[PDB]
Amino acid sequence: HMTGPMCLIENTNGRLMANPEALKILSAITQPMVVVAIVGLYRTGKSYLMNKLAGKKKGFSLGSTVQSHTKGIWMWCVPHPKKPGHILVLLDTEGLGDVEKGDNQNDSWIFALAVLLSSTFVYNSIGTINQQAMDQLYYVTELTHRIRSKSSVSFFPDFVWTLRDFSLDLEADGQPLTPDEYLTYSLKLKKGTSQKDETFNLPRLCIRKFFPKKKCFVFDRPVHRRKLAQLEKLQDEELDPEFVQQVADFCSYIFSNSKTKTLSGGIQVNGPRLESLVLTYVNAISSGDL
Amino acid sequence: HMTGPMCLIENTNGRLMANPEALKILSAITQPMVVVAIVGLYRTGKSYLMNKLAGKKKGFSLGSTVQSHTKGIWMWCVPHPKKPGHILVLLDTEGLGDVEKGDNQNDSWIFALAVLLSSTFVYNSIGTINQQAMDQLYYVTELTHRIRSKSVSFFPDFVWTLRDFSLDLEADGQPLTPDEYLTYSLKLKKGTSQKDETFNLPRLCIRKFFPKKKCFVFDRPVHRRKLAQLEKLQDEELDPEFVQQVADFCSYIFSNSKTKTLSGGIQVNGPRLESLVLTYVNAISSGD
Ligand SMILES: Nc1nc2c(ncn2[C@@H]2O[C@H](COP(=O)(O)O)[C@@H](O)[C@H]2O)c(=O)[nH]1
Ligand SMILES: Nc1nc2c(ncn2[C@@H]2O[C@H](COP(=O)(O)O)[C@@H](O)[C@H]2O)c(=O)[nH]1
Ligand code: ALF
Ligand code: ALF
Ligand SMILES: [Mg+2]
Ligand SMILES: [Mg+2]
């Protein structure tokens, strides 16, 4: 049916535009949708992980260069491998912090759309969880509220942090951590009444409230090789064997746990209803708030 | 001289303070100084690369876990390996973006001090040059002017060190040296629209602020899944290319990094560095 990805939201010269051809395809799919979007800094292996969710070696194209490759937001609608009669919709995004673009405002919009359109939202980083990403997640979360206002049980997405090229010991304060406990460690509140105790707390309170469920997975370097240039065409046997497992566990969690996308009121989102969200939210951005 | 590093600027509960023991060591050193500082996100291999400048296996301690390890600003004064009668002062810094700390303002001060105190400033990142790193570098150079106001260029030279570098050095069909990658990342936009001007203004300020720039790439130090034992490994246990890239970095620092200088052209020795540390730490500890 849908034989490869297609640009859903174009990103050309500062302007975010819905692709009519993608909208057409969406308007033909009447099945309910599980929507999994991924965002993170550019050149962090996002497109590759998304191809795993499709069960394919190739799909969203990777790019082997210091330049950004994924632009705007791409979609790939494929049969949901565990829930009969559902469609799994994969949303692959333009990486954050491209120095060729140099446009933060534009980053925020893409980030925001990804959150607004998803039922599972995947934030992808290398090595560590880091405050600057947590600051940005919080900002975009709040912006998401302003966009919903401009038009106008929970229908906010569940949350996954994917840690790439993970090489450090999962320990803190003498104590081992699971990946999940590392995430909740990172969102832990300062006990104090004190003032700054409150500045520190407040973003964390907001992220914890916005995303109802949370999950964290670590991934080894895919390959031992010093270069990733040939990745698209290496079979599992040529990859690091614990990377392969880690990817399986991740996919299997997404397949088992990611909920059907839902409108406020509880109505389930299918093609025509996603098409109508895309336009609503792109129009709301094309206007003028920040 | 110094058998190991020590804390120069402590960082406790939002307070940055000079270590009197460190100042006392500074005040005894009459020789002119080359000062190399390193900044970047936390857990990014900063302390390891600094130890290679000191030609020791162990030194600034690394730490194995997800938690930050280097706190505040540490110093290591060793004889300059290429300039007789000079001292090489290495400043290793608390990494940025620590989720345990969750204090951007503290990050800034540490970032500003490193810039203010150095004669070569090394900014260290994984994989790419990110715009978020550029944005903060701009922010901090401006802050720097503010701090200097509370009380022939003497601004440091600049080096971007790219870690775990795995991507093809190539942009728009054309192959890049690391240096051409840095200058590509600071390229200005043709036109003169509002948003051309916004894009340009950070890039103009960085390029003006740092007289010389330079860029190195480093492979992953090891192939092993985990970094844990990395204090202990010899050069033949490491990635061969990483060893050569480090040799090349070090030999660039040794050859090219200038003596630290005050405005008016006076060369900074221990007592003059001491007085800079106090001056800048007090200005931060006062009220903006
Ligand atoms: N460092 C790293 N790069 C990866 C990984 N997976 C794929 N890549 C590379 O990341 C690039 C795509 O990243 P994206 O811009 O989609 O975030 C491609 O070069 C792809 O080969 C990974 O696990 N770690
Ligand atoms: N990913 C990565 N980590 C490294 C590298 N060199 C050393 N490390 C690790 O980086 C951590 C220290 O980083 P720092 O907090 O000083 O920036 C230690 O765990 C050290 O073993 C490197 O080249 N790449
Ligand atoms: F750099 Al990309 F998707 F190619 F973030
Ligand atoms: F996490 Al560090 F120096 F130990 F930035
Ligand atoms: Mg991509
Ligand atoms: Mg360190």
UniProtKB/Swiss-Prot annotation, chain A:
**Effect of mutating residue 69 to A:** Abolished GDP hydrolysis
At which positions is GTP bound? 40-47, 62-64, 92-96
Highest rank taxon of the organism? Eukaryota
Q: How is it modified after translation?
A: Isoprenylation is required for proper subcellular location.
Task: Give the gene name.
Answer: GBP1
Could you describe the subunit structure of this protein? Homodimer; homodimerization occurs upon GTP-binding and is required for the second hydrolysis step from GDP to GMP. Undergoes conformational changes and oligomerization upon GTP-binding and hydrolysis. Heterodimer with other family members, including GBP2, GBP3, GBP4 and GBP5. Dimerization regulates subcellular location to membranous structures. Interacts with SQSTM1. Interacts (when phosphorylated) with 14-3-3 protein sigma (SFN); leading to GBP1 retention in the cytosol and inactivation.
Q: What is the effect of changing residue 46 to A?
A: Loss of GTPase activity. Constitutively monomeric. Expressed throughout the cytoplasm, loss of vesicular accumulation. Impaired ability to promote pyroptosis in response to T.gondii infection
Provide the induction entry. By IFNG during macrophage activation, and by TNF and IL1B.
Q: At what positions is Phosphoserine found?
A: 151
Location in the cell reads: Cytoplasmic vesicle membrane; Golgi apparatus membrane; Cell membrane; Cytoplasm, Cytosol
Give start-end ranges for the coiled-coil region(s): none
List every stretch annotated GTPase domain (Globular): 1-290
Function description = Interferon (IFN)-inducible GTPase that plays important roles in innate immunity against a diverse range of bacterial, viral and protozoan pathogens. Hydrolyzes GTP to GMP in two consecutive cleavage reactions: GTP is first hydrolyzed to GDP and then to GMP in a processive manner. Following infection, recruited to the pathogen-containing vacuoles or vacuole-escaped bacteria and promotes both inflammasome assembly and autophagy. Acts as a positive regulator of inflammasome assembly by facilitating the detection of inflammasome ligands from pathogens.
- Changing residue 191 to R: reported impact? In 8KR mutant; abolished ubiquitination by S. flexneri IpaH9.8
* Full protein segment contained here: 6 to 309 of 592
Q: Which family does it belong to?
A: Belongs to the TRAFAC class dynamin-like GTPase superfamily. GB1/RHD3 GTPase family. GB1 subfamily.
Q: What is the effect of changing residue 43 to A?
A: Abolished GTPase activity
Instruction: Please state every residue range assigned to the domain named GB1/RHD3-type G.
Output: 30-259
- Disulfide connectivity for this sequence is none
State the protein's name. Answer: Guanylate-binding protein 1
Q: (Microbial infection) Glycyl lysine isopeptide (Lys-Gly) (interchain with G-Cter in ubiquitin) cross-link located where?
A: 188, 190-191
